[PDB]
Amino acid sequence: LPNIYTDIEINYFLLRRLLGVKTDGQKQAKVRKLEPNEVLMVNIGSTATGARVVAVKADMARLQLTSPACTEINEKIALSRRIEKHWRLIGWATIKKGTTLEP
Amino acid sequence: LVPRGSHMTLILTKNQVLHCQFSSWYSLFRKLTPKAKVIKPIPATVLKYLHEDSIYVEQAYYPEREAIQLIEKAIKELGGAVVPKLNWSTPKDALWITTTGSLKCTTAEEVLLLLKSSDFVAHDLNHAFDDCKDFDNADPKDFSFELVLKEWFPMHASTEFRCFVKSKRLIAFCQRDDNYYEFLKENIDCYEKLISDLLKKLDTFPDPDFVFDVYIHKDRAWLIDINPFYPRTDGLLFSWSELESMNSENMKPEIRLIPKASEGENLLEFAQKWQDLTN
Numbered sequence: 001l002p003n004i005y006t007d008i009e010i011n012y013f014l015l016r017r018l019l020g021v022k023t024d025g026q027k028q029a030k031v032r033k034l035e036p037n038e039v040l041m042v043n044i045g046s047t048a049t050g051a052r053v054v055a056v057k058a059d060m061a062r063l064q065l066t067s068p069a070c071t072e073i074n075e076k077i078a079l080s081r082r083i084e085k086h087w088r089l090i091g092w093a094t095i096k097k098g099t100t101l102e103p
Numbered sequence: 104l105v106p107r108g109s110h111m112t113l114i115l116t117k118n119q120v121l122h123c124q125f126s127s128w129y130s131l132f133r134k135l136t137p138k139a140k141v142i143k144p145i146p147a148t149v150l151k152y153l154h155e156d157s158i159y160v161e162q163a164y165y166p167e168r169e170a171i172q173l174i175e176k177a178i179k180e181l182g183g184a185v186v187p188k189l190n191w192s193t194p195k196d197a198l199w200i201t202t203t204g205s206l207k208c209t210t211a212e213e214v215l216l217l218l219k220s221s222d223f224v225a226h227d228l229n230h231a232f233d234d235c236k237d238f239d240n241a242d243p244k245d246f247s248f249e250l251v252l253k254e255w256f257p258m259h260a261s262t263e264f265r266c267f268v269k270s271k272r273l274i275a276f277c278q279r280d281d282n283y284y285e286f287l288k289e290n291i292d293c294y295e296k297l298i299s300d301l302l303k304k305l306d307t308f309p310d311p312d313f314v315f316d317v318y319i320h321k322d323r324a325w326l327i328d329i330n331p332f333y334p335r336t337d338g339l340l341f342s343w344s345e346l347e348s349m350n351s352e353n354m355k356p357e358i359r360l361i362p363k364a365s366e367g368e369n370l371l372e373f374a375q376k377w378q379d380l381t382n
């Protein structure tokens with residue numbers, strides 16, 4: 001069921017901490033809570049767009065994309081945050097609800 | 104002392120990087136470049152916001168109302184649309200965050216969102232002097248960051264060329280876009296004249312080796328930027344080993360275009376193969 005969406009409701013899970021091993025022997029920085037009015041970088045398939053976090057419940061988040069994206073409900077997504085001037089992967093999600101551009 | 108040639112192993116110097124700043128060459132070549140406004144030094148509030156991690160929106164630090172009004176003032180003075188840049192790089196790597204898929208910015212937030220999500224801009228901020236043997240990067244002399252707002256215009260990527268200069272002589276030039284255009288081969292001699300004549304207007308430029316990016320519209324070869332003559336800047340259709348190997352003495356530059364018949368075309372072609380039997 002493919003369509004063009006502006007706002008998406010995701011069921012997510014975050015990483016305990018960022019990927020990699022620090023050469024020092026030190027632990028990678030802990031992945032912090034999803035924050036409203038923070039622009040993430042979502043990978044909705046081949047589509048890479050920003051997603052303004054408007055609201056969060058538990059493992060639920062309401063994101064409003066920067067421009068319309070082509071997907072379906074139950075599509076697997078990768079959430080990313082700008083950490084240390086790098087787009088670090090913070091978690092994963094699935095589209096549960098979406099608001100179409102015009103229909 | 105041994106006289107070195109003009110083909111020696113290239114290195115990057117503090118000065119080379121400094122001369123390539125928008126403010127540095129813009130003062131020199133204002134006449135040759137399309138309308139732009141430079142905010143120097145960058146409002147400290149904007150800079151502090153750029154160093155903050157994640158990208159927080161107003162619609163958690165955000166720049167002071169003073170800077171937003173200042174950026175927005177410059178934008179209306181540039182026709183309402185602008186293309187942002189820090190001292191050297193535009194956020195072309197972050198067009199995915201944009202509503203339109205372009206560097207066009209109307210709102211001061213549009214500018215921030217781009218700069219805040221670009222690794223090229225992140226390079227400007229932290230790695231501008233990572234290759235200079237001249238400077239010690241531990242924390243960069245009488246330097247400051249600048250926010251360049253260039254008046255936006257519908258610019259056709261087809262007539263954008265990257266021009267390579269070694270010892271004040273035009274070494275070679277190529278197309279900037281990666282798509283094929285048939286009309287380029289037809290007008291290439293005219294573009295080559297236009298770009299060579301522009302270089303004549305760049306003799307004031309401090310260094311003898313630089314890469315100047317151009318935009319040709321009508322019978323005008325507009326100067327877009329001056330990038331250093333170092334592998335840091337993309338050689339595009341040229342390898343940086345090829346650029347070093349080129350004769351800076353030769354009167355003719357090497358042109359490179361993206362690659363892809365009538366009875367008349369055939370025998371005009373067969374008229375040249377007749378001149379290969381002569382000289």
Ligand SMILES: Nc1ncnc2c1ncn2[C@@H]1O[C@H](COP(=O)(O)OP(=O)(O)OP(=O)(O)O)[C@@H](O)[C@H]1O
Pocket residue numbers: 186191192193194195206253254255256257258260263279316327328330336337
């Ligand atoms: N004023 C403008 N209006 C529209 N598009 C523009 C404008 N200025 C630049 N561009 C677009 O942005 C691209 C990059 O611009 P510019 O050459 O100024 O940036 P740059 O980051 O310094 O280049 P590079 O990183 O390749 O050395 C151009 O190829 C063109 O597509």
Ligand SMILES: [Mg+2]
Pocket residue numbers: 191192328329330
């Ligand atoms: Mg440049």
